[PDB]
Design a protein around this ligand. Structure first.
Ligand code: HEM
Ligand code: HEM
Lengths: 394, 394
């Protein structure tokens, strides 16, 4: 007698478990138990992952319903799970999306200067350096302060909520509520701060006093600040970190990108595709009875869309484990999801990674791990897979 | 077909695995495979642990022999494994041991002021607080700078070597050598620094120019600084952290110690006894064929002395999982080892814990975890078990 298969399989973000391919072949939708004890359907083929993400009857919003089977505990108010819907309903969709493009004047140069300044300080200090805590995450944090229009010096305390805010927990987390409420108060103060005129918060500040948005709540405006900061910083910092591992472990690739940096966009797209940053399947709740492969998913059941399931599917991406800069379908991966909830920061994230890698390869062309790869400490019960420290030398 | 049982069993430092008791009953010496692929004998009963630690033919020094079966890779020069022997041979044993007592004038008050100042800053900043990174470890770090006679401001960079120096790795760690050599150069500079006149380094500085120690190497003096700083900081910071978890999880105990703080020494002794801080058995290499329980250990074989094996042995400590402040045999645990290599900092460590707990209970009598216990991220492939962050509220 064995128990029902448990998810997630491994918190290690540097390699995919052999088990994923075996499951995809045998049972590309199959029943699993989450950390809460809930049952769920784990979907692991490209075809079935795409089907679920593209069918809105597999609802994100309804995952927050009281009494639903849960992947993990809410770390935000239940109405905040439908944040993008709330944004759209408030007529704020176009403005939010415009404010988080990497195309804003000066932004890319700010990114490059910031990356270069972080790297110079590591160089000055001498190897070993921690590329997560002292490069990737600070770069992510600086980027999102600039994108939000908020002071850089406020970034670190906001950042420090995230090790808790993005926990994947069986039970509610008291600290998450403390940090949430505090971070909300900060963003509400920002909207009242006349010095804040640029970026997302500057724009929301103005829209908040525009008559065309008079009956949009202050709660929604502050929520947008907290959610976009947290999602952006955690996602870009975590992605860049694990992409750096994948690069460092492929010196031939590292050298080619150092040699031909115009291939970096193609490289970052592949690093996105193979990225194991998302620790859990994307949760959705069936709002109807829906056939998914050989399984009739019943209304009220939880479905988990395993991103690496899709992204390493050899039917869609032949030789899935190899980075190939000339695939015919390079952006057709699901690293930024798909459908209604496709990542609004995908371009900004792509650019954070491109610029951080560009700068790292220039300043540290000899970059290598300073510890054997198995020594990396992978964060557990978290919504991302990340090494606690990423020690490198150069 | 199963593989040979692997060690360590779990990096979780908040509970002992049920498997340890089962093993102790069934097979209190049994064969296991280490992370290097080496075979070893894992010893898990009080009686057999004590036998091994008290028989010097189970050698610490010989664990460093080229070609021996290894628990993990050396992170120091092989001659440094015999550091205490080297100390004794150089006539430095009495001086080193005297310099690391908690009885030095002002030391306890420095500890208390430092603990109180760390706590006030957490209070000012507001919950949640990380009791590992922003209390236990800084307290350990400050204590050891003061004990060594070195500037407090030098503590943080020395501290940052330790996440690597105390790795438990299958392979040599390049960063460990970088940090070792750098930290050695620092301690050599300290011995040449005329401002350094107090503590262990002040005393070694003087003995280095005393004719009675003329043919003791500069290498040994600097090595003593690096080894005593690292072992002391890692051991006291890690112990206090996990003792804090054990306390916090027992509010009745926490309240009693807050109420009757004179029971704190008895409490710290029990917290020592149940402490899971050591991630691996203590390694020893047989220098002869020696009968240990039902096993004839052969010369050249590795033996691992599982401290919690001894310390949770119900034959020696009845109701082993319960903290009892009135045991008849309270200091007979093996938390500081036993025999030739008994911890030279045991009193200093006891006092760090007592004072840190005293101060925490006074400043934060309402101290509780701010996250569910399962959310703590336990450091892997490391010589200690420690949570990466210890989020608390009060
Ligand atoms: C490489 C970097 C990034 C990756 C891999 C990533 C990944 C993802 C994925 C997979 C989703 C889909 C969630 C779902 O469908 O259940 C998503 C949505 C989202 N992302 Fe990203 N993201 C990245 C960067 C960013 C940035 C920079 C921001 C903000 C500045 C951001 C903000 C959001 C938000 C607010 C959502 C929710 C969308 C919705 O519910 O409609 N992301 N992201
Ligand atoms: C609660 C705190 C502490 C614990 C639990 C602890 C634990 C231990 C243990 C189990 C050993 C035996 C190693 C073996 O036999 O293989 C040991 C030895 C040692 N400890 Fe500690 N220790 C603590 C505090 C300290 C401090 C504060 C220092 C230095 C300032 C220190 C320095 C050393 C050294 C240098 C050895 C090697 C002894 C030898 O090889 O003869 N320890 N410790």
């Amino acid at each position: 007698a064995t128990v029902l298969l448990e998810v997630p399989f491994s918190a290690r973000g540097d390699r995919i478990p052999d088990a994923v391919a075996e499951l995809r072949t045998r049972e590309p939708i199959r029943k699993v138990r989450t950390i809460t004890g809930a049952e769920a359907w784990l979907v692991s083929s490209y075809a079935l992952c795409t089907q679920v993400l593209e069918d809105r009857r597999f609802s994100m919003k309804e995952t927050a319903a009281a009494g639903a089977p849960r992947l993990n505990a809410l770390t935000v108010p239940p109405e905040v799970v439908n944040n993008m819907g709330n944004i759209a309903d408030a007529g704020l969709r176009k403005a939010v999306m415009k404010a988080i493009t990497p195309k804003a004047p000066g932004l890319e140069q700010f990114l490059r200067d910031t990356a270069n300044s972080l790297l110079d300080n590591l160089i000055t200090e001498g190897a070993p350096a921690d590329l997560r805590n002292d490069f990737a995450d600070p770069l992510a944090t600086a980027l999102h302060c600039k994108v939000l229009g908020i002071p850089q010096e406020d970034g670190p305390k906001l950042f420090r909520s995230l090790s808790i805010a993005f926990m994947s927990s069986a039970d509610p987390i008291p600290a998450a509520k403390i940090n949430w409420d505090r971070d909300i108060e900060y963003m509400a103060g920002i909207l009242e701060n006349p010095n804040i005129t640029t970026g997302l918060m500057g724009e929301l500040s103005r829209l908040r006093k525009d008559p065309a948005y008079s009956h949009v709540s202050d709660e929604l405006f502050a929520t947008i600040g907290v959610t976009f900061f947290g999602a952006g910083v955690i996602s870009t910092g975590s992605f860049l970190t694990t992409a750096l591992i994948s690069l460092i472990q492929r010196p031939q690739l590292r050298n080619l990108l150092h040699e031909k940096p115009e291939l970096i966009p193609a490289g970052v797209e592949e690093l996105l595709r193979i990225n194991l940053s998302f620790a859990d399947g994307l949760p959705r709740l069936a709002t109807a009875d829906i056939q998914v492969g050989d399984v009739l998913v019943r209304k009220g059941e939880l479905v988990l869309v395993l991103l690496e399931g899709a992204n390493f599917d050899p039917e869609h991406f032949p030789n899935p484990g190899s980075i190939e800069l000339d695939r015919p379908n390079p952006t057709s991966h699901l690293a930024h999801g798909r459908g209604q909830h496709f990542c609004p920061g995908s371009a900004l994230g792509r650019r954070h990674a491109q610029i951080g890698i560009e700068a790292l390869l220039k300043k540290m062309p000899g970059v290598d791990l300073a510890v054997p790869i198995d020594q990396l400490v992978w964060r557990t019960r978290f919504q991302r897979r990340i090494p606690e420290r990423l020690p490198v030398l150069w």
